[PDB]
Every structure is written in structure tokens, then in C-alpha cells.
Design a protein around this ligand. Structure first.
Ligand SMILES: [Mg+2]
Length: 455
């Protein structure tokens, strides 16, 4: 073919144990005569869809799973065929991260989620419930310290509590995420966010705490607890703090539901070496000995293979990661998560600051996400159609007129696209510069129009 037959080329990020992975590849070659080449290009996750579309690229790509949904929609990933006996060797939830339109499109490798991190000297037995945290803060305040500090600026960090009693990102049903069903506007998300705001109002936490401030406070022994992932363990100053890592607290007797990222291995749809790639991944890498080779080069954290997870879980920090991940929410593998992230970032910051109420903030978030999705659709349309498909500094606020895109005939083509994608009638009296000066204004017009008729 155009990818070389009888050879395996693998792409993995340079912050992974690629040298340990290469050791697995050497033993594959010893047994089969097939050479394995491990490469770690910069920006490999952007290069892959470019070169795969032309029939090129690696036979196997390693990356976080949430990117593989777009690769699959472009038809770049082969459908993988592990029998049920093999699937049984990995924790069942990991296979839900690697499915697209009913099909398995990758092998789970390692699993990552937030955990509760705590100062053992200040707090030898950390709390099991969010509810008992205000009582713990008051005791520690008497000795000039606080119970808990974590990054309240980024919704990825506050979602575990918001989703605990019923939040979700996108509804998952019949194998597919429904981008019209964002799970922010319900009683469970409101309950979680409400408990978070009341922590702020009762001064147990401060709304401006971000990543760095929380990390510094924990290293100084000023706060007994924080919330962070495995990437942060090496920055904990163990010359000052003896720390442990544990299951997140419950809310209303429900586990916190942190988002779960799954490092996954996909097979290039243009590779003629699909069967060799399956053999390598199933019978060489996804084994106690294969994962150990990678782990010894650079730790994998918690792994999807049950047997080796049991071994690594002798490290209680790793056991905690997997327990939190089993209770968490798999990150949806669709490009519309960018709308979710934007919409929920806004709502949590506003609820925390007193700007909106928990109720108004969460109801607003569904509308904001749809708005963001439409903007994205428009930006891509305008780029693909008038700019060769590349967004060279194209924003929702970019001035369409000065770009020389809103031509004298091209405007009505844009109106039509707007009519199709939003199912509203757009009269001639709405076709004026303040409505079409930017993508944001076009979306705002569409949003305003929908209400006028639906009332
Ligand atoms: Mg078998």
C-alpha cells in the first residue's frame, strides 16, 4: 500500500514512556520478524487527521480518547474486533470511551481522573462527605488554616460536585451523544452547584482561588485538602507535607463524578497492517509485561487492564485514581464539548460570584452552548467556503465586512445557510450590517428570531 506493509509505525506523545513502548516493539519483532517503530512527533494529534486522510500516517496512534470521535467521523479509524473474552480483561467502563456510532474504534490503555489530596499531619482521616466539610473548616480555622482549596476557575475541577446528584455533559443514548440534551438544567446539577456557592458564602472557600493558589496553599500546609489529578503529585513538596490521595467525598450519599480521560490506541483505517496491529496491541502491549515496560519508563497511572491495575494499585494513590474514575463520567468524544466547556465555565463563575443565581446560571448554560455550537458551525462554513477551510485568526467577533467576505451577492448565500441551520424565516428587513457584521451578531439575530415566533 502507501503505508508500508509488514511493518508497524506507532505515534505517541513525547511525555509518555515511548522508550518502554519501543522495548515492547523489539520483542514483537523478535517473535514475528515485523519491525515496530515508535515516533513522537510534535502536534501528532493535529498531524494525524491531515496525513491519514491522504492514506498516510502511522499504523497506530496513541492519544486521549475524546479526540478519536472526530477521527472516526471522518472515517480515519479502523473498526476494532476484540472478542468478548478480551473485552472482559479491561474494566467495562473503559470500553464506553472508545465507541463511535455503535462501533469500537480503539483500545483503552490508561485512565485518568481527579482525586481528593490531603495533608495527613493536619488531617489523618479525611472526610467521606462534602456535607461534613464546613464543620471541618471551622475546627481548622481555629488553628489558622482551612479545610479545602481547589481551582474554582475551571469547570473540569468543579464538575465532580455538580454532576454528583445528576448533572451530565451530553445525554448518551442509542450509542450516540445528543447535542440538544445538555444536562446542566436539572435538579441534580443545581443541588451540586448550590452546595458549592454556599461553601463560598459561608467563607469556607474563596471564589478567586485558581490552580496555582490552591497548589501553593497545600504545599505550605495552610489548607488540609485539595482536588487535583496525577499530573500534580510530583509538585507536592514532600519535604513539607506528608500527603495522601483518596476517593472524592460523596454528595447526598452519591459519589462525585469527575470526568474520565482514557489514553487509547487506534488503528489507521488506511493501514494494510490491521491484523498485526491487533496482535501487537492485544497480545504484547495489553499484558502485565507490556504495560510494565512502558510504566517503568514513565508511569502510566491507573491502567485499563485489570490484572496489572491490581499490581499497580499497591500504590494507594493509583488505587484512588481508578476508584474515582469508575464512579466518574466518561468525557464525550465529540467536538461539541467545546460548547459545553464554554457554557459551563461561564455559569459556575457567575454562580460563585453572585452574578446569577444557581437557577438562572444553569438554565442560561443550555442556551449558551447552542449558541456556541452555531457559531462554530458558521465559522467553519465561512472558512471552508471563502477561506480554503483554514481559520486564520477567525473569531465569532471577526469583522466579516472588512475581511471582504460579505460580498454583494455572497450575503444571500449566508442568509440561506442561516435559514437552513436554524429553521427561522429571515426577512429582508433583517439583512443589514449590524446583524451581519460578525458571526456573533448573526447568531444573536437567529437567537432573537427564534423567540419572536415561539410566543
Ligand atoms: Mg481471544
Amino acid at each position: 500500500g502507501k503505508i508500508e506493509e509488514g511493518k508497524l509505525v506507532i505515534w505517541i506523545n513525547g511525555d509518555k514512556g515511548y522508550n518502554g513502548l519501543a522495548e515492547v516493539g523489539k520483542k514483537f519483532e523478535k517473535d514475528t520478524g515485523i519491525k515496530v517503530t515508535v515516533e513522537h512527533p510534535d502536534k501528532l494529534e493535529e498531524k494525524f487527521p491531515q496525513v491519514a486522510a491522504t492514506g498516510d500516517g502511522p499504523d497506530i496512534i496513541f492519544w486521549a480518547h475524546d479526540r478519536f470521535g472526530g477521527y472516526a467521523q471522518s472515517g480515519l479509524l479502523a473498526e476494532i474486533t476484540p472478542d468478548k473474552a478480551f473485552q472482559d480483561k479491561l474494566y467495562p467502563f473503559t470500553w464506553d470511551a472508545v465507541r463511535y456510532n455503535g462501533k469500537l474504534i480503539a483500545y483503552p490503555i490508561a485512565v485518568e481522573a481527579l482525586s481528593l489530596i490531603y495533608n495527613k499531619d493536619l488531617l489523618p482521616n479525611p472526610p467521606k462527605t462534602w456535607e461534613e466539610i464546613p464543620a471541618l473548616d471551622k475546627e481548622l480555622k481555629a488553628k489558622g488554616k482551612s479545610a479545602l482549596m481547589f481551582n474554582l476557575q475551571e469547570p473540569y475541577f468543579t464538575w465532580p460536585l455538580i454532576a454528583a446528584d445528576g448533572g451530565y455533559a451530553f445525554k448518551y443514548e442509542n450509542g450516540k451523544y445528543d447535542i440538544k440534551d445538555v444536562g446542566v438544567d436539572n435538579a441534580g446539577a443545581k443541588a451540586g452547584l448550590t452546595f458549592l456557592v454556599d461553601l463560598i458564602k459561608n467563607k469556607h472557600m474563596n471564589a478567586d482561588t485558581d490552580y496555582s493558589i490552591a497548589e501553593a496553599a497545600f504545599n505550605k500546609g495552610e489548607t488540609a485538602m485539595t482536588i487535583n489529578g496525577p499530573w500534580a503529585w510530583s509538585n507536592i513538596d514532600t519535604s513539607k507535607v506528608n500527603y495522601g490521595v483518596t476517593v472524592l467525598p460523596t454528595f447526598k450519599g452519591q459519589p462525585s463524578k469527575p470526568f474520565v480521560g482514557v489514553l487509547s490506541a487506534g488503528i489507521n483505517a488506511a493501514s494494510p497492517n490491521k491484523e498485526l496491529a491487533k496482535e501487537f496491541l492485544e497480545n504484547y502491549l495489553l499484558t502485565d509485561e507490556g504495560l510494565e515496560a512502558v510504566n517503568k519508563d514513565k508511569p502510566l497511572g491507573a491502567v485499563a487492564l485489570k490484572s496489572y491495575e491490581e499490581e499497580l494499585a499497591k500504590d494507594p494513590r493509583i488505587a484512588a485514581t481508578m476508584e474515582n474514575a469508575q464512579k466518574g463520567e466518561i468525557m464525550p468524544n465529540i467536538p461539541q464539548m467545546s460548547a459545553f466547556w464554554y457554557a459551563v465555565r461561564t455559569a459556575v463563575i457567575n454562580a460563585a460570584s453572585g452574578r446569577q443565581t444557581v437557577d438562572e446560571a444553569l438554565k442560561d448554560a443550555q442556551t449558551n452552548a447552542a449558541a456556541h455550537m452555531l457559531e462554530s458551525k458558521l465559522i467553519q462554513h465561512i472558512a471552508t467556503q471563502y477561506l480554503d477551510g483554514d481559520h486564520d485568526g477567525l473569531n465569532a467577533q471577526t469583522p466579516l465586512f472588512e475581511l471582504n467576505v460579505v460580498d454583494s451577492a455572497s450575503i444571500f448565500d449566508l442568509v440561506d445557510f442561516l435559514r437552513q441551520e436554524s429553521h427561522v424565516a429571515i426577512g429582508m428587513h433583517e439583512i443589514h450590517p449590524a446583524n451581519f457584521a460578525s458571526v456573533q451578531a448573526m447568531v444573536a439575530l437567529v437567537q432573537r428570531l427564534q423567540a419572536q415566533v415561539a410566543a
